[PDB]
Structure formats: structure tokens, C-alpha cells
Design a protein around this nucleic acid. Structure first.
Ligand SMILES: CC(=O)O[C@H]1C[C@@]2(C)[C@@H](C[C@@H](O)[C@H]3[C@@]4(C)CC[C@@H](O)[C@@H](C)[C@@H]4CC[C@@]32C)/C1=C(\CCC=C(C)C)C(=O)O
Ligand SMILES: Nc1nc2c(ncn2[C@@H]2O[C@H](COP(=O)(O)OP(=O)(O)O)[C@@H](O)[C@H]2O)c(=O)[nH]1
Lengths: 122, 85, 62, 671
RNA sequence: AAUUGAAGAGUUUGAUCAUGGCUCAGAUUGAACGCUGGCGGCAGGCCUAACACAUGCAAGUCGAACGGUAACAGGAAGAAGCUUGCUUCUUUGCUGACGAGUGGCGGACGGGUGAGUAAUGUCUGGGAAACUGCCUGAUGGAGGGGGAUAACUACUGGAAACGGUAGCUAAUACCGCAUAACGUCGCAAGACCAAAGAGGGGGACCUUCGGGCCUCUUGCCAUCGGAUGUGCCCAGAUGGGAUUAGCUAGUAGGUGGGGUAACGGCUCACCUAGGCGACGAUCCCUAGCUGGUCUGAGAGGAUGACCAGCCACACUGGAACUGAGACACGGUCCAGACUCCUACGGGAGGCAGCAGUGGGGAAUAUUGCACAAUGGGCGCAAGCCUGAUGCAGCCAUGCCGCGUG
RNA sequence: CCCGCAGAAGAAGCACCGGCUAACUCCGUGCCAGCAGCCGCGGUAAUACGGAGGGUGCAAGCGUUAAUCGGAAUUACUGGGC
């Protein structure tokens, strides 16, 4: 459950550190993004070197939500915090090159393969 | 790392575990002696010193503690076991 | 920095990549360097014959 | 050292219109040859039938845009496999690669790909090669059915209906005989295959007239003799996708495409001195001579320089000569791209191709010859760009780097060009077309990380007057405090006609007996001169102006060079104001060369482009159209000229004159 | 015989001199660029990004420590196609030899770089509390037992990296026991400490016929010397800044414990309240030091490439383990930045070793030949290893010769 | 390294020439084009610009730039001043 405003941590290099969701893309009036959805983003923190700089506007992939995820059977995965992987505005597709912290099976997408190839877990 | 004399790594490991365990007990024995001094028991001090002397010497020989260390222990342990005891 | 372009004529325009020399022009206060003719994107002086080593002009075909 | 097979060398390049499979078909080879963009691989013949032959393949671009990649990719190598879409007929860029093959008289066979596709029709296309390309086809084969009912092919030499099987893609065979369907068709060959083979030599056909069925061995030699002499194009057909056909075509390569010795020895020159064909027989024991086609740069080994060795040999360390630059190079590591591995080499013989690592300054077209036996070779031709567009480095910082990068892309692609407009100093690139330009700029982002946006090039406008203006008056009189200084001048300003090349400006000393001394008269000229560098309408040079002195006045002392120089300056103004000034624009002598079919559309567009037409010839096959059309209006012509003439239409332009710009233009051109 | 060598000129004025600065003649260079370019000898060659790195090489070696047989070779506890003393198959580790494994020694040398370090270093001269592989002198010891484990075998997980269970085995691997001074603690009396075998040959006597046994050659343990190496201490010298004047809690000293190879706030508890600084502490900036190099008549000024000595560093921060020696350049562990491999679960790597690419730049070279020599590691030796070294390739980069009559 | 073979045969550039500074004329140019280490050359007879002839200095190098010391007693201990 991510929604406009809401700070997210970032799970890649690129160098964002802290980032804010300025839109839940994908539908009129769509309230929440979570799981492995895409959101428009404005960088709030940014390391000094880094691909991205503060004030940039990009997209990103929700990779960990505290409300977590369910899928079949009835179980739950919850993560302590909210994190995402920055995507280039045109091609989706991570602008980063390393992923940090575990990611979930749901992300097993054509476009998000590069994330689960990286990333040390689930 | 691709230099096969990395057997040195697996080798000197066996070494560390061996050294560790022997070096461990010779310490716990030296302790037993200091304990006696703290307990005040003149008998157990000179008794425990007799038990530890061979250990300290043997290990020094085997090259785990080295000579002058061996000396220094029985040296000032003695100093103390017969300073009030 | 501002730099001198010696010899009669030159190519040399807004994007030319040159090699700057050092050596003033005491008619041009502020101009403290020469641009080395014949180096990189600067051509040598057309049709010159004497002192060709300065002005980057090659020997004309013995 | 020793070498190995030699003279069993097949230097062939695949090229054709877009789609077609001219690449898919190439990968298919590497599969077949590799049982158990330049590459090499070994074909023993699909049946085991052959002594292993060594094949150098080059998959070329379709498209135009990158036609340069075919000039080079056909100049150097010996054979050519022209691919055709079973569905798409000849199509425009088939004709262009045809002309490029003819330009270099390169022997060639033909492969009608995609027989499995809806609307497939082998013999139709074969006929278009005859009709549209004015060439002599010879169906060396026949298709077993068509489109989704495409099951095989007929070797109509060996007269058997070749059968490729289900799995293992290719390989296997069982060489089945013709089916009852085609026996009628099959009993042709184009009997003028065998009658085409006949025409090699009359003593070869004399027995054909005498009804003597020719031996299989003597036919293959027969039509090959004529393939080599490019009087015949064998057609093979197949479908890379179904794996039903590619293989039979490889055989046709060794059967009917040259060795490096079935070849005219190279032409050329000596250095300073004069001609002589450089000759140099295709022989290992000749003096080394090679041409450099294609330059690249790999991030790990540095500069790669592809060459074709026509004569002699080079060993890693031999210091050859770039004859067309008058400097020597020392060969180092050598690489052959070897199906899928940059295999290393210490020696490279004649008749082979490879890329030389580390060579310093060797551009495309240069000859690498023996230093004792220097020769210049032919050098292909450089297609000459048709499109220009101005570029600026998005980030002012990058402006330096944009310079570096465009430079690099130039020495890699001679068909690409870059320069700086002598006026309105903006960076201008030029290429063989819209797409060409696109991927160049894109290549900057990828490889040099300079993104830059693009725009229409600026235009150099000029200024003039239209009315002779009668005696206008200039005057100075500076009683201020210092140098006395006073000058007075009266003149006539009048338009000219485009006269005497260098001037475009005319000053006349029709001064009275001595109303102004002739020592100050140079000055009054200088004063006008100054005003011409950027006239009063909108900067921009003033042209085609004439000026006549007639009257003035001075003090015996106060007047001076300066005084009249200003007086003239003032006299020029007010006179210009009253002279009905106008904004000029530049026009081009434009020459469009187009087919008969669409000279209607082309004319109309030239007209639409605010253009004047002036002639038509009907020069042979196209129709040269002559027109005067303004510059600020020809931008991106290539792109549309193509659309209007199916890609088939050269054109050319250069400066001609300046004419009045239409008002809405003029008032727009306001800075 | 051998630090015995000091030059001036142009430029303000109508002219002059001085003033001052500017400028010039010389020598020098790891140079670059422009024009030009024949050879050879000797030497030099990334000064910038201690920027990032594809590929190959730069550390192994002993079967005379051990169990051993994967490949080679030979012999055969012996066998075909017959090509009967000339072959190619199966056995047998028998012998030569040898992949993997245990073990030993080396990997702390050799080589690279200058990041850090203004004094934790370097230089000069001294000093006392120390350890020291291989090499060496001397004196004796080298007895008698025990438990294991790789390899291996059997199941078994991985894509790979790597392994996992159970069982078996050898030794100079490992541990007791004995022996115990000219060794250690102790005033003494007294307590207490080690070790390993292996090869070549052989008369008898001989035995399970393995060899006992004899001999020579090595290796093992202990103590004291020598040699070399290393650690520690002191004084003096070794950049600039006051537009840095105050600095200091393990701080300065002491006592007693602990600790190291060793002295020591090295550490800790308590007691003293000290310690440093205008002879520049402190804090800033910059920097490897020296022999020497360049210049200069000298004193000086400038400088620390190439050679040699010392120090420091090894992708960045940190830590220890093994060891005589490291807190380890091609070792281990943690962490970080980054790159690479993956069958997505998981893996791997650090050229400032040689060559080489990209990058940066005005600019700096071959992905060469060889261990023949000198030298280094292992080995009784033969030998194996050696990008140290010896040569070659590239460049007029310098020096010196010679030619182009 | 020596011994044979053929034939001058395969092998010369670079800066300078107004004073400092060794080396001078014609032509072109006309405060233009340009030179320039310092002073300074160029506005119709320019040994100073550019070409030529000639000369001067160096020579497989020659120039230019950059750099350290020198001359600079111009941080003066040696060895200066107010
Ligand atoms: C691989 C090959 O053989 O040609 C490829 C490769 C190709 C010739 C490309 C067209 C064009 O970029 C070519 C240029 C000159 C483009 C400009 C620069 O970037 C050059 C360095 C580049 C070299 C090769 C390149 C990149 C090809 C195409 C492109 C087709 C594009 C479309 C939209 C149909 C082709 O062949 O069709
Ligand atoms: N179905 C089918 N497709 C083919 C065949 N040959 C080529 N193609 C297709 O052609 C397309 C482009 O192939 P490629 O050779 O790369 O094109 P090129 O590079 O322009 O020659 C791909 O979709 C191929 O699958 C064929 O024989 N059958």
C-alpha cells in the first residue's frame, strides 16, 4: 500500500537513498501501489556521485512493502520497510546495477528479471 | 586464490585449531594457580603450581608459548605463592 | 584564455581543437599564448616557404 | 610459416533489401557449417561430397543509409549471394545493391528466401531479376510447392528432388527424385540452362546441337565459367526458417562462385611516377598488397582494422606500408572472426581477410602494400551524403565532447560528414539519410555519452536596395573641443545586377574638379565599406550596392580621413532608409534525377518548395529535372524525395544566387 | 697526481649616470611540439588517474618423509592377430617415474608503487632490556609406547563454486611415558622440559627371508657459541604558516599486578598533579628520507626518475591466524565501493609483478626469446620453478662514434 | 670480428642575416598583410613584414615551447640598503 506522498527506501545503487512517490500509475483514481507495481517518483535524498540526483523525476518498482504480500495458500510476507528499484522513465528497467535486501517471487516478470537475477533472496 | 599453495590455508587452519586448544588449557591451569592465591590456600597454590609447571614448560618446548614466557609465569607465580603463602 | 594565431590566414573556427604554445604578443595585453600552427586542427600557413618549421608548413616536394 | 588449404577460398557477401533474411540466412549457415559483420567457417559440402572449402562470409545491411557498408562489402570480396524475398519482389534496395555489384563487376548467384511465406512465388521473382534488373537469370533449381506447402527443392542439374528432414534442422537427405507434379517443368532446366551452359564455348555446344547429353561434370564447369564472367545469375531458392533450402545454396557457392584466383588481378598505380596496373597476381609468393575496408574499436583490444589481402603475405611483425598516407605501419596481433571466436593469428596469406589490432592511422580505403613494391589500389567509392541537420550539445559542457565523438564516427564512416558553418557557426553533420543520422546521434549517447538535440540548419541571408536614391547627404561638423574635424559628402546609392564575382560592391569617384581632395576620397569609400558588414535590415551582409560621389565640402585644415569616414557612414544611412531595402535569400541550382513513373510528383514538389523549374532532358532511363529552389526550403529533401519515388532518386545542389525573399519570409527573418 | 676557479649585454633621455625592474648570451631535461631524418654502440622511456581493467604469464619444489597408484614408460606373480625374440592387448606398483592427498621447506625473498607519513620515518652518532629459519663450532642425547586423519571406499546434494554423511589407512603429521643438564623457576634444598627417521652397499651369523645385522650419507632433539637478520631506546639534523597561542585523562610521574622476544602507560587499580609550549607546542597547508642529481668560482639555489641503502603501501576501512619471520602484493576473516559468472537457488575477483587495453594527457614502449650465464626456491643429486636476470622488439629521448664520398 | 663481391653507388635537413648577435640585397606590400625574447619594424624606394638570390650558424638533427640554476651583489653568511 504505497500511495502518493510516502517515502520509499531504494534497493539498488543508482544512489537514491530516499525517494517520494508522486503518483500511482496504472489507472484513473488508482489508490495504492504495492507488491510489484510501478510508481512515479521524485528523488528526495541522493548520494553525491550516483546515476540520479536530487530533484529528478523517474519511475520505480515497489519491491518491498510493509503491508507485504499474500499469494496463494494464505501465508504472508511482510518486510519491515518500504523499498523500490528505480526505473528509467522510458524503458522501465533498472537504472541501477545491484540489488539489496531480499525481493519476492511475485516480481518474477519479464521486465523485472534483472532484479531477481541480482538480489540475494526469495 | 588460483595459487595451489593455498593448501597453506587449509594447513595452517589445522594449526590454529591445534594451537588454540593446547594454548587454551595451559591458560586455564595458570588461572587455577592465581585462583588459589586469591582463595588464600597456600597448599593448593603450591599444589596447583606443581600441576602447571610441566604444562608451561612442555608447551614452550613444543613452540607454542616460547621459553621466556614459560619462565615469566612460574617466575612471578612463585614470587607470590610464597609471598603470603 | 585568449590566444594568438600567427601567420597569414588560418582556418580555425568555433569548434577547432588546437594546441596552445605560450609566448606573448606585446601588442595584445592579455594575450599570453600562441596557438601552434600545423598542430591538431590548425593548418599550416598556406604557400609559406621560409621558417616553415614555425607555422607548420611541410617541405614542398623535392 | 606453412599455410594449409589455399585457393579453396570463398569470399562471399550476402546483401539484399530489408527483411529478406539476409542475416537469418547467414546464421543458418554457421549452424550447417558448424556441425558437431564478417565471420569464417568450413563447408565440406552437405553430402560429404567436397574437399573442405574455407568460406569468408559478410552479412551486409539492407537499407540505404548504410550503403557504405556494401560498397566496401563488395569492393573487397570475390563472390555475392543476392537474397530475394519469396513474397517481396525485387524492391528498390535490391536494385541499388545490384548496381553496387555491377560497379565492381562482382560475380554472383541468387537465393530466393522465404519460400514458406504466404504469397511465395519462386519463378515470379526470378523473372523480375530479368525484367527489373535487366540481368540474365538462370533457375539453377525449382521449388517443391510454395508457402505453407513448401516441402523441398529440385536440383535440376543432378535432377533429383532434394529432401531435408524434420529434426536436426538440416543435414541428412535421401536425395529423392522429382515428383510427378513437376516432371513437365523439371524437363526444362530451362533447357537453356543446358543451352545456357552450352553457350560457354561453341565446341561445348556443338555436341549439344548434335544431341549429346552433356556430362554433369562439364556443365557445372560450363555455367560456372559464365557465372564468373557475370553473364548469368544462378537462382537457388529456399526457406531459412523451415531449414529447407539454405544448404543446397552453400554448395552452389563453391560450385559456381569464384576462388580468389578465378579473379582479375588487382588494378592500381605506382607512387609518384605513373600507372601500370599494380597487377599483383593472386599468389602467396607475390609482394604483399591489401586494402583496408572497415575501421572499428573494441573496448578491450583497441582499434580493429579489417583488410583483404590481394597479394603476397603478412606476418605478425612485418612492417607494411600505408601507400595512400605515406607512412609505414607495423603489424602486430591479428584476429580472424571465426564463426564465434576472435581466434588469433601470426600469419595472414593472400585471398583471406582479417582485422589488424593496434594499427595507428589507417582509414577506410587505404592500401597496405610491400614497402619495396609500393602500389595504390582502387579504393571503392564514398557514397556522398544526401542529408544535413545541425546539432547542438544539449549540455553546453558536452560541446567539447560532441566534437570528439563526431570526429570518431567520421573516420569510421566516410559516408558520414561533419563540419562547422563558416557563417552562423553551428555544428553541421551530414549522412545518407534520416535513419543514418538517427543512429549516429544515438551512437553518441551509447558510446560517448553525449546527448544533443537537433535542429534545422540556419541560413545566410543578405541585404540590398531596389531603388536608385538620388543625391543623399552626409555631414559631420564637430566643433566640440579638440580636433576641428568636419566632412561633408553627397552621393547616389543604386542597386546593381549580380556583377563581377569578387565585388558585389561598386564605388565611383565621379567627384567634381576638386570639391573634396582625392586624399580623403579613399576614406569616404572605407566609411561605406564599414556599413556593409551587417546592414540595417537585420544584421547580414549588404550586397549588390553601387555608390557615386558627386558633391561635398571641407575646411582647409579641419577635415580629415576620420571626418569624411563618419560623413560617409551617416550618408549611407538615410540613403539606405529611403532606398527601399530588402531581405535576400540564397537559391540553389538543384538537379533531381528520377524515374519516368513519378516525374509528375517530383516537379510539383519542387514547385511546392517555392521553386522555379528550368529543364528536363529525359536523360536515358531517369529524367534529370532542373530547378532553382531556395535553400531554406530544401531542408530534409532527401527524406521526402525518397517517399515520392520509392527510394529511387538521386539529387544534387549547390549555390546559385540571392533573390528577394517573399515578405512573410522576410518579416519572419527578424533577429 | 686527485673539489687550483669568479666576464657581461639591451631597455626611460636632446644627451648622462644611477635607480629597478623587465630582457638576453650558458649549462641542464624521464621532456613535448613543428619541419627534417642514414647506421651503430651504451643508456633511458606513464612525470598526469595510488583511474578502472579483458587475456596469458610473474611460486614452487621434494617419491632420498608417508600411504599410494590416475596417466606415461619399462619390465611381465605371461598373453595373440602369428610379423618366434622384432610387435600391441590383459594383468602385477615389481622398477623407472608420477595426477590427486597427507607431510616438509618455500609462499615475509624476488618485483611494483609513493598513496600515507614534517617525524609513528629518514640521516648522523650512540645505547640496553631482545628474538633470530636455512649456514656454522662444541657437548651429549636419539629409548619405549598410544590415539588419529586426509587420500581411499560406499551412499549422496550443486548449473557451478563447492561439498555432505558413514567407514577405512600411512609417516619425519599428532599426543602421552621414559630419559633431564653446562637448560628453565628457585637463596638453596629441590621441582620440571625434547626428539624421527630415511636412503646406497655389503662379508660372515641369520630370520617370520620384510630384512635382523654391519657400514657409510643424511635427517631428528637439547644446551652454549659464531654468523646473518630483526625489534626496542637516546641526542642532533631533516618543509612553510602566528591572518594558528595556548596544548594535555592513560594525560606527566609513582607503586603494585598483568603483559611482550624484550625495556616501557604497553595495560590496569590506586596515590601523587603533573607533562608540553614563543628554542613555536597546538592546529592548518604541503611532502617519502638518503647516497646522490642539476647548477654555481664558492657559499648557495633547485631537485630525490633511472642505480644503491632505509621507510611505507598492496581495491577502500578493519582484524587476526599460521609462522623463526607477516598482522602477509598474486594468504585467511569482516565490512564497503565496484566488476564478472549463474540452470536464479547461488558464486567469484582486485596488474602500484611482466606484457597489454580503455581513460586521463603536450607526452612515455612488445600481449617477444630463454633459463645459456649470474642469482633466488625446493632437491643427496639429476633436475623442476624463476616476466628476478640475461637478451631482443619499439621511440633521435639522451650521450658517443661513423657515413651520406 | 675477419675475408670476398658490385658501384658514388642507398643516405641533408633546420633556424637565423635591424641592434643585443655571426650573417645584405632585389622584388611585393603601403600603419595593410604581418613581425616581435627586449628596444622596436609597417602610412610607396622596408637589410625588421612576405617571396627570391646571397650569406651566417648548427647538422641527423634543428627550432619553438615548458622547466631548474646562472648571470641576479635583484633576500647581499660569504655579499646590499633606508
Ligand atoms: C549490422 C549491419 O550489418 O548493419 C547494421 C550496423 C549499421 C550498418 C547499421 C546502420 C547504421 O547504424 C550503421 C552506421 C553507419 C550508423 C552511423 C554510425 O553509428 C556507424 C558507426 C554505423 C556503422 C554500422 C551501422 C551501425 C545497421 C543496420 C541498421 C538498420 C536500422 C534500421 C532502422 C532498419 C542494418 O544493417 O539494417
Ligand atoms: N518464417 C520464416 N522466417 C524467416 C525465414 N528466414 C528469415 N526469417 C525471419 O526474418 C526475420 C529477420 O531475420 P534476419 O536474417 O535477422 O534479417 P536481416 O538481418 O535483415 O537479414 C526474423 O523474423 C526471421 O525469423 C524463413 O525462412 N521462414
Amino acid at each position: 500500500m504505497i500511495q502518493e506522498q510516502t517515502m520509499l527506501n531504494v534497493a539498488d545503487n543508482s544512489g537514491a537513498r530516499r525517494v517520494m512517490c508522486i503518483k500511482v500509475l496504472g489507472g484513473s483514481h488508482r489508490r495504492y501501489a504495492g507488491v510489484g507495481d510501478i510508481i512515479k517518483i521524485t528523488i528526495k535524498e541522493a548520494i553525491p556521485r550516483g546515476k540520479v540526483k536530487k530533484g529528478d523525476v523517474l519511475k520505480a518498482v515497489v519491491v518491498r512493502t510493509k503491508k507485504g504480500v499474500r499469494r496463494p495458500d494464505g501465508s504472508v510476507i511482510r518486510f519491515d520497510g518500504n523499498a523500490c528499484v528505480l526505473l528509467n522513465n522510458n524503458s522501465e528497467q533498472p537504472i541501477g546495477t545491484r540489488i539489496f535486501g531480499p525481493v519476492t517471487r511475485e516480481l518474477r516478470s519479464e521486465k523485472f528479471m534483472k532484479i531477481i537475477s541480482l538480489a540475494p533472496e526469495v | 586464490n588460483i595459487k595451489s599453495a593455498k593448501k597453506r590455508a587449509i594447513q595452517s587452519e589445522k594449526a590454529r585449531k591445534h594451537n588454540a586448544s593446547r594454548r587454551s588449557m595451559m591458560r586455564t591451569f595458570i588461572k587455577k594457580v592465581y585462583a588459589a592465591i586469591e582463595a588464600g590456600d597456600k597448599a593448593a597454590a603450591q599444589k596447583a603450581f606443581n600441576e602447571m609447571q610441566p604444562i608451561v614448560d612442555r608447551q614452550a618446548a613444543k613452540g607454542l608459548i616460547h621459553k621466556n614466557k614459560a619462565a615469566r609465569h612460574k617466575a612471578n607465580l612463585t614470587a607470590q605463592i610464597n609471598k603470603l603463602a | 584564455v585568449t590566444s594568438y594565431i600567427g601567420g597569414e590566414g588560418h582556418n580555425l573556427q568555433e569548434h577547432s581543437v588546437i594546441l596552445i604554445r605560450g609566448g606573448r604578443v606585446k601588442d595584445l595585453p592579455g594575450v599570453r599564448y600562441h596557438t601552434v600552427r600545423g598542430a591538431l586542427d590548425c593548418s599550416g600557413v598556406k604557400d609559406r616557404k621560409q621558417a616553415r618549421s614555425k607555422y607548420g608548413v611541410k617541405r614542398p616536394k623535392a | 610459416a606453412r599455410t594449409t588449404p589455399i585457393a579453396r577460398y570463398r569470399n562471399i557477401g550476402i546483401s539484399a533489401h530489408i527483411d529478406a533474411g539476409k542475416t537469418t540466412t547467414t546464421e543458418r549457415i554457421l549452424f550447417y557449417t558448424g556441425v558437431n559483420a564478417a565471420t569464417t567457417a568450413f563447408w565440406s559440402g552437405m553430402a560429404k561430397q567436397y574437399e573442405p572449402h574455407r568460406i569468408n562470409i559478410i552479412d551486409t545491411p539492407g537499407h540505404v543509409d548504410f550503403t557504405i557498408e556494401v560498397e566496401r562489402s563488395m569492393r573487397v570480396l570475390d563472390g555475392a549471394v543476392m537474397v530475394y524475398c519469396a513474397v517481396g519482389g525485387v524492391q528498390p534496395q535490391s536494385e541499388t545493391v545490384w548496381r553496387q555489384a555491377n560497379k565492381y563487376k562482382v560475380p554472383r548467384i541468387a537465393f530466393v528466401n522465404k519460400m514458406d511465406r504466404m504469397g511465395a512465388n519462386f519463378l515470379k521473382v526470378v523473372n523480375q531479376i530479368k525484367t527489373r534488373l535487366g540481368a540474365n537469370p538462370v533457375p539453377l533449381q525449382l521449388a517443391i510447392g510454395a508457402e505453407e506447402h513448401f516441402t523441398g527443392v529440385v536440383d535440376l542439374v543432378k535432377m533429383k528432388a532434394i529432401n531435408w528432414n524434420d529434426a536436426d534442422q538440416g543435414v541428412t537427405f535421401e536425395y529423392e527424385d522429382i515428383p510427378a507434379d513437376m516432371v513437365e517443368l523439371a524437363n526444362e532446366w530451362h533447357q537453356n540452362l543446358i543451352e545456357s551452359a552450352a553457350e560457354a564455348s561453341e565446341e561445348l555446344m556443338e555436341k549439344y546441337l548434335g544431341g549429346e547429353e552433356l556430362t554433369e561434370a562439364e556443365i557445372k564447369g560450363a555455367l560456372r565459367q559464365r557465372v564468373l564472367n557475370n553473364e548469368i545469375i544462378l537462382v537457388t531458392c529456399g526457406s531459412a526458417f523451415k531449414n529447407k533450402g539454405v544448404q543446397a545454396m552453400l554448395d552452389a557457392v563453391i560450385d559456381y562462385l569464384p576462388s580468389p584466383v578465378d579473379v582479375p588481378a588487382i588494378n592500381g598505380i605506382l607512387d609518384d611516377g605513373k600507372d601500370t596496373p599494380a597487377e599483383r597476381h593472386a599468389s602467396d609468393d607475390e609482394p604483399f598488397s591489401a586494402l583496408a575496408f572497415k575501421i572499428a574499436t573494441d573496448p578491450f583490444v583497441g582499434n580493429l582494422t579489417f583488410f583483404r589481402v590481394y597479394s603476397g603475405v603478412v606476418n605478425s611483425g612485418d612492417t607494411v606500408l600505408n601507400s595512400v598516407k605515406a607512412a609505414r605501419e607495423r603489424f602486430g596481433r591479428i584476429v580472424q572472426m571465426h564463426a564465434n571466436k576472435r581466434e588469433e593469428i601470426k600469419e595472414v596469406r593472400a585471398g583471406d581477410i582479417a582485422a589488424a589490432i593496434g594499427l595507428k592511422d589507417v582509414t577506410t580505403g587505404d592500401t597496405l602494400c610491400d614497402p619495396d613494391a609500393p602500389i595504390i589500389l582502387e579504393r571503392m567509392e564514398f557514397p556522398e551524403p544526401v542529408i544535413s541537420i545541425a546539432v547542438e550539445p544539449k549540455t553546453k559542457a558536452d560541446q567539447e565532447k560532441m566534437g570528439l565523438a563526431l570526429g570518431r564516427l567520421a573516420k569510421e564512416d566516410p559516408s558520414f560528414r561533419v563540419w562547422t558553418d563558416e557563417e552562423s557557426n553551428q555544428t553541421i553533420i551530414a549522412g545518407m539519410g534520416e535513419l543514418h543520422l538517427d543512429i549516429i546521434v544515438d551512437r553518441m549517447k551509447r558510446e560517448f555519452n553525449v546527448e544533443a538535440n537537433v535542429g534545422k540548419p540556419q541560413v545566410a541571408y543578405r541585404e540590398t536596395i531596389r531603388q536608385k536614391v538620388t543625391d543623399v547627404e552626409g555631414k559631420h561638423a564637430k566643433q566640440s573641443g579638440g580636433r576641428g574635424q568636419y566632412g561633408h559628402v553627397v552621393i547616389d546609392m543604386y542597386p546593381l545586377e549580380p556583377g563581377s564575382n569578387p565585388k558585389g560592391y561598386e564605388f565611383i569617384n565621379d567627384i567634381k574638379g576638386g570639391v573634396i581632395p582625392g586624399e580623403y576620397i579613399p576614406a569616404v569609400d572605407k566609411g561605406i565599406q564599414e556599413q556593409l558588414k551587417a546592414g540595417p535590415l537585420a544584421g547580414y551582409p549588404v550586397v549588390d550596392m553601387g555608390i557615386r560621389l558627386h558633391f561635398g565640402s571641407y575646411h582647409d585644415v579641419d577635415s580629415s580621413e576620420l571626418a569624411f569616414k563618419l560623413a560617409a557612414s551617416i550618408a549611407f544611412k538615410e540613403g539606405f532608409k529611403k532606398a527601399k531595402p530588402v531581405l535576400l535569400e540564397p537559391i540553389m541550382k538543384v538537379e533531381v534525377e528520377t524515374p519516368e513513373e513519378n516525374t509528375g510528383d517530383v516537379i510539383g514538389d519542387l514547385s511546392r518548395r517555392r521553386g522555379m523549374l528550368k529543364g528536363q532532358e529525359s536523360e536515358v532511363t531517369g529524367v534529370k529535372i532542373h530547378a532553382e529552389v531556395p535553400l531554406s526550403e530544401m531542408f530534409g529533401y532527401a527524406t521526402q524525395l525518397r517517399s515520392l519515388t520509392k527510394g529511387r532518386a538521386s539529387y544534387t545542389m549547390e549555390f546559385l544566387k540571392y533573390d528577394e525573399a517573399p515578405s512573410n519570409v522576410a518579416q519572419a527573418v527578424i533577429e
